[PDB]
């Protein structure tokens, strides 16, 4: 039974070949199941979960293999940009919502609101 870290770093070509033979052996268990045999049948859940684990690691491997080539550049693609809600994405940014004309800015800057005490 294979785990995450033993194949988490090995050659992707060997990963592909091993998955190829894994699926061929799954088809072999399918030969067995179609035949009168049903004994080798309970480990397919474990093999399926192992495939799922190896594949969510493999797609992350391809993920940095494909995003390191493009990182930053300030024009991220449709998927790689931020995925906030539509209203949040279309909202005015906070700095430019708080931006003020030169008149009000000079008023506040040169003479602000400030606290005090009553005796």
């Amino acid at each position: 039974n294979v785990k995450a870290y033993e194949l988490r770093t090995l050659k992707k070509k060997e990963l592909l070949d091993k998955l190829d033979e894994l699926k061929k052996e799954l088809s072999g268990l399918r030969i067995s199941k179609a035949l009168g045999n049903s004994a080798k049948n309970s480990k397919i859940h474990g093999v399926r979960k192992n495939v799922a684990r190896v594949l969510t690691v493999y797609n992350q491997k391809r993920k940095m293999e494909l995003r390191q080539l493009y990182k930053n550049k300030k024009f991220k693609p449709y998927n790689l940009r931020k995925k906030l809600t539509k209203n949040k994405r279309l909202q005015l940014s906070p700095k430019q919502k708080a931006a003020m004309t030169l008149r009000q800015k000079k008023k506040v800057q040169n003479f602000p609101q400030r606290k005090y005490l009553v005796v």
Partner: protein, 89 residues
């Protein structure tokens, strides 16, 4: 006469007026005029009416699965910046 008002005419009921209505899956898609009687699929609107609260409630939001908003829920409580992951061991 032989195919009169009742059973005789009922014997002629072959061929259907409505069908599956791919937008809703209900057998209410008029075939001749090509328009759903439950939602009006060719039109972009969903065809509700305020005089039938029963039909409103039996297809309003939440009667389905909510593939997206149910995951989007309980996220304002966390306020996690996107791309963030918990600290490793």
């Amino acid at each position: 006469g032989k195919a009169g008002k009742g059973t005789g005419s009922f014997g002629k009921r072959n061929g259907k007026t409505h069908f599956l209505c791919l937008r809703c899956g209900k057998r209410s898609y008029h075939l001749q005029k090509k328009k759903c009687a439950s939602c009006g699929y060719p039109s972009a609107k969903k065809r509700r009416f305020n005089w039938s609260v029963k039909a409103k409630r039996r297809n309003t939001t939440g009667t389905g699965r909510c593939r997206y908003i149910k995951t989007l829920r309980r996220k304002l409580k966390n306020k996690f910046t996107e791309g963030s992951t918990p600290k490793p061991k």
